[PDB]
Every structure is written in structure tokens, then in C-alpha cells.
Design an enzyme around this catalytic site. Structure first.
Site, PDB file in Angstrom:
ATOM      1  N   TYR A 107      -7.528   3.094   9.183  1.00 26.07           N
ATOM      2  CA  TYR A 107      -7.487   2.657   7.786  1.00 26.07           C
ATOM      3  C   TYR A 107      -6.180   1.988   7.400  1.00 26.07           C
ATOM      4  CZ  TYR A 107     -11.887   4.794   6.830  1.00 26.07           C
ATOM      5  OH  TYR A 107     -13.237   5.104   6.837  1.00 26.07           O
ATOM      6  N   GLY A 139      -4.370  -0.892   7.528  1.00 30.38           N
ATOM      7  CA  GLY A 139      -4.623  -2.284   7.866  1.00 30.38           C
ATOM      8  C   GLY A 139      -5.807  -2.815   7.076  1.00 30.38           C
ATOM      9  N   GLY A 145      -9.492  -3.820   5.759  1.00 38.81           N
ATOM     10  CA  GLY A 145     -10.683  -2.994   5.722  1.00 38.81           C
ATOM     11  C   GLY A 145     -10.396  -1.537   6.053  1.00 38.81           C
ATOM     12  N   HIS A 156      -5.607   5.435  -0.270  1.00 42.18           N
ATOM     13  CA  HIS A 156      -5.150   4.243  -0.982  1.00 42.18           C
ATOM     14  C   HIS A 156      -6.225   3.179  -1.069  1.00 42.18           C
ATOM     15  CE1 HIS A 156      -2.991   0.389  -1.420  1.00 42.18           C
ATOM     16  NE2 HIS A 156      -2.046   1.064  -2.042  1.00 42.18           N
ATOM     17  N   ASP A 157      -7.006   3.019   0.000  1.00 39.90           N
ATOM     18  CA  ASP A 157      -8.078   2.039  -0.028  1.00 39.90           C
ATOM     19  C   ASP A 157      -9.083   2.358  -1.138  1.00 39.90           C
ATOM     20  OD1 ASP A 157      -7.075   0.786   2.240  1.00 39.90           O
ATOM     21  OD2 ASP A 157      -8.768   1.243   3.536  1.00 39.90           O
ATOM     22  N   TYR A 193      -7.728   1.746  -4.625  1.00 41.01           N
ATOM     23  CA  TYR A 193      -7.863   0.330  -4.936  1.00 41.01           C
ATOM     24  C   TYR A 193      -9.310   0.013  -5.288  1.00 41.01           C
ATOM     25  CZ  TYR A 193      -3.263  -1.655  -4.190  1.00 41.01           C
ATOM     26  OH  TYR A 193      -1.942  -2.009  -4.330  1.00 41.01           O
ATOM     27  N   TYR A 201       3.420  -4.939 -10.971  1.00 42.88           N
ATOM     28  CA  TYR A 201       3.630  -3.862 -11.945  1.00 42.88           C
ATOM     29  C   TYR A 201       5.123  -3.622 -12.093  1.00 42.88           C
ATOM     30  CZ  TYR A 201       3.318  -1.527  -7.375  1.00 42.88           C
ATOM     31  OH  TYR A 201       3.491  -1.169  -6.062  1.00 42.88           O
ATOM     32  N   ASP A 243      -0.052   3.132  -5.303  1.00 41.22           N
ATOM     33  CA  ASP A 243       0.939   2.693  -4.331  1.00 41.22           C
ATOM     34  C   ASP A 243       2.006   3.775  -4.160  1.00 41.22           C
ATOM     35  OD1 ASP A 243       1.212  -0.989  -4.713  1.00 41.22           O
ATOM     36  OD2 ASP A 243      -0.486   0.336  -4.281  1.00 41.22           O
TER      37      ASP A 243
HETATM   38  C1  LIG Z   1       3.224  -2.770   1.517  1.00 39.76           C
HETATM   39  C2  LIG Z   1       3.468  -2.935   2.989  1.00 39.76           C
HETATM   40  C3  LIG Z   1       2.157  -2.906   3.754  1.00 39.76           C
HETATM   41  C4  LIG Z   1       2.581  -2.538   5.181  1.00 39.76           C
HETATM   42  C5  LIG Z   1       2.776  -1.019   5.090  1.00 39.76           C
HETATM   43  C6  LIG Z   1       1.486  -0.553   4.386  1.00 39.76           C
HETATM   44  C7  LIG Z   1       0.504  -0.147   5.478  1.00 39.76           C
HETATM   45  C8  LIG Z   1      -0.911  -0.568   5.112  1.00 39.76           C
HETATM   46  C9  LIG Z   1      -0.989  -2.069   4.870  1.00 39.76           C
HETATM   47  C10 LIG Z   1      -2.470  -2.436   4.749  1.00 39.76           C
HETATM   48  C11 LIG Z   1      -2.669  -3.900   5.112  1.00 39.76           C
HETATM   49  C12 LIG Z   1      -1.975  -4.783   4.078  1.00 39.76           C
HETATM   50  C13 LIG Z   1      -1.452  -6.041   4.756  1.00 39.76           C
HETATM   51  C14 LIG Z   1      -2.543  -7.101   4.851  1.00 39.76           C
HETATM   52  C15 LIG Z   1      -1.953  -8.472   4.563  1.00 39.76           C
HETATM   53  C16 LIG Z   1      -2.850  -9.578   5.091  1.00 39.76           C
HETATM   54  O1  LIG Z   1      -2.050 -10.690   5.390  1.00 39.76           O
HETATM   55  C17 LIG Z   1      -2.432 -11.862   4.714  1.00 39.76           C
HETATM   56  C18 LIG Z   1      -1.352 -12.892   4.856  1.00 39.76           C
HETATM   57  C19 LIG Z   1      -0.115 -12.394   4.155  1.00 39.76           C
HETATM   58  O2  LIG Z   1       0.888 -13.374   4.334  1.00 39.76           O
HETATM   59  C20 LIG Z   1       1.989 -12.791   4.979  1.00 39.76           C
HETATM   60  C21 LIG Z   1       3.068 -13.813   5.106  1.00 39.76           C
HETATM   61  F1  LIG Z   1       4.269 -13.267   4.888  1.00 39.76           F
HETATM   62  F2  LIG Z   1       3.078 -14.346   6.337  1.00 39.76           F
HETATM   63  F3  LIG Z   1       2.905 -14.831   4.249  1.00 39.76           F
HETATM   64  O3  LIG Z   1      -1.706 -14.165   4.266  1.00 39.76           O
HETATM   65  P1  LIG Z   1      -1.797 -15.421   5.292  1.00 39.76           P
HETATM   66  O4  LIG Z   1      -2.480 -16.595   4.621  1.00 39.76           O
HETATM   67  O5  LIG Z   1      -2.404 -14.874   6.566  1.00 39.76           O
HETATM   68  O6  LIG Z   1      -0.256 -15.734   5.493  1.00 39.76           O
HETATM   69  C22 LIG Z   1       0.453 -16.384   4.412  1.00 39.76           C
HETATM   70 CA   LIG Z   2      -6.960  -0.487   4.671  1.00 42.46          CA
END
Ligand SMILES: CCCCCCCCCCCCCCCCOC[C@H](COCC(F)(F)F)OP(=O)(O)OC
Ligand SMILES: [Ca+2]
Ligand SMILES: [Ca+2]
Lengths: 124, 124
Positions: free
Chosen positions: B28, B30, B32, B48-49, B52, B73, B99
Site C-alpha cells: 500500500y 505507493g 493504488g 491513509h489511502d 483520502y 493546507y 497526512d
Molecule cells: C509525501 C511523500 C510520499 C513519499 C513518502 C510517502 C509514502 C507513500 C507515498 C505514496 C505514493 C505517492 C507518490 C506518487 C507520486 C506519483 O508521481 C507522479 C509524478 C510526480 O512528479 C514527481 C516529480 F518530482 F518528478 F515531478 O508526476 P510525473 O508526471 O510522473 O512527474 C512530473
Molecule cells: Ca497507496
């Protein structure tokens, strides 16, 4: 991997806040992306997105069985310059390359504040 | 917003590279998430999922048509203690609390190296 892509954005743009700056920009910087990109920075993101799709289709990446953001590569930052380490196997090199070009792309395009945080459902 | 979640974690967990250790963890942590969470930490991400998902179905968030990661926020950090501002309006308050809840949860859950970068196709 995603953390490495952020690392590269900070290398290419030393004072950047990559998530703050480029998550939720335009129609394509962010998970997904549909519509016409709104500007050069957005078109960078569309290119990255395309590149990743192309990695998933890559024969070298055939044992990649999730998101290319889950694939680690070896890379180094050198005074603003990004190098995908020559040791990288084929799938790792291709994905490191996707990220590195997008990183450089980010550093060269104009940032348009008004394009940030779009209602993508109305405008993308 | 997601960048804030990232700083929330660095608040509760001084060591932390959030994108690096918490992303791509278990079933979980990451994108989905499906399957049976593989440990308490993985349950922090499952919870957390769900928060949300709750946030999107909450009347106070009805004008938020995107994903809660794009909602900014107001929050604070002092002494590895996280503050969701009193002046958040209701959606923002809710999302900030999802969060905060997660970052704290991350801080007490054991981190199990062998659960990092799991074959989710296979195991979730
Ligand atoms: C708040 C920090 C999250 C990491 C610790 C939390 C653990 C859980 C995280 C769950 C997943 C959340 C992350 C998913 C993000 C998806 O990534 C999407 C991506 C985000 O961009 C990152 C970048 F910095 F490179 F810009 O958009 P993309 O168009 O691919 O690139 C611009
Ligand atoms: Ca997730
Ligand atoms: Ca995208």
C-alpha cells in the site's frame, strides 16, 4: 526510481522543490495527464510520460513488472550536470535517461505560475 | 498537498528520505494498493489511502474534484511534532489530519527492509 528523479531535478535546478514545483502543474506534470499540454514545461512532462510508456514496452524492461518509478538506476550529479552511470543495465539506463532528459527539460523551460494546480477536469 | 506530506514525515522522522523509504513499500505504500497489507507500516499506508477516499466522499471536500494530494493546507513542525492549523477550513483540516496521522504512524511502525519494493503483482 521516483526519489532518484527528484534528486535529478534538484541537481539540474539546485534550489528547486521538485514536488512543490512540478507535481500538479499543467495537464501532464503529475500522475497521469490528458489533453493538450499547456506549455513547454507541460510538454516536458508529457514527454516523460511517453518515455515511461515506451520503457514498459521495451524488450530490455520485460522483467519490469510495475511502474518504472519503482526501478532503480545508478546516476550521479556533477555541478548541475546529470550523468546516467555507464554501468546501468539496459532497462535501468533507458529509465535513467527518461528522467535525466525530463530533468534537463524542466531546467530549460519557462515556469508559468498560472499553469500550476489546474482543474484538469475542466481544462485537460 | 503531497509536498507537505513529504515534509510532515521529515518532521516526525528526523532521519527520513520519504520518497526513498516510504514510497514503493509493501502493498500500500505507493500508487493504488490492493491485497492484504504486509505489516503495520503497510497498514499505515492502507489507512491513509482510505482516509483520502474518505476525504473525496466528504461533503466539505465537494469542490475538490481532483485528488487530495493536490489540496494545499496549513501545517507546522516543532520538535518533530506536527501541527494542523486551526485556520484550515474543513476539507483542508481533514486532509491535513490524514497526512499527520500517516506520518506519525510511519514513525512508530517497524520498517522491514524485506518488505521494500515488493512484487505487488505477485504478492498483493
Ligand atoms: C509525501 C511523500 C510520499 C513519499 C513518502 C510517502 C509514502 C507513500 C507515498 C505514496 C505514493 C505517492 C507518490 C506518487 C507520486 C506519483 O508521481 C507522479 C509524478 C510526480 O512528479 C514527481 C516529480 F518530482 F518528478 F515531478 O508526476 P510525473 O508526471 O510522473 O512527474 C512530473
Ligand atoms: Ca497507496
Ligand atoms: Ca503525468
Amino acid at each position: 526510481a521516483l526519489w532518484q528523479f527528484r534528486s535529478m531535478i534538484k541537481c539540474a535546478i539546485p534550489g528547486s522543490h521538485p514536488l512543490m514545483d512540478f507535481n500538479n502543474y499543467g495537464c501532464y506534470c503529475g500522475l497521469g495527464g490528458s489533453g493538450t499540454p499547456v506549455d513547454e514545461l507541460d510538454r516536458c512532462c508529457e514527454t516523460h510520460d511517453n518515455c515511461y510508456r515506451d520503457a514498459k514496452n521495451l524488450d530490455s524492461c520485460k522483467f519490469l513488472v510495475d511502474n518504472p518509478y519503482t526501478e532503480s538506476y545508478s546516476y550521479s550529479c556533477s555541478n548541475t550536470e546529470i550523468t546516467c552511470n555507464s554501468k546501468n543495465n539496459a532497462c535501468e539506463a533507458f529509465i535513467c535517461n527518461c528522467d535525466r532528459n525530463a530533468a534537463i527539460c524542466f531546467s530549460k523551460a519557462p515556469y508559468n505560475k498560472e499553469h500550476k494546480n489546474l482543474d484538469t477536469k475542466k481544462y485537460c
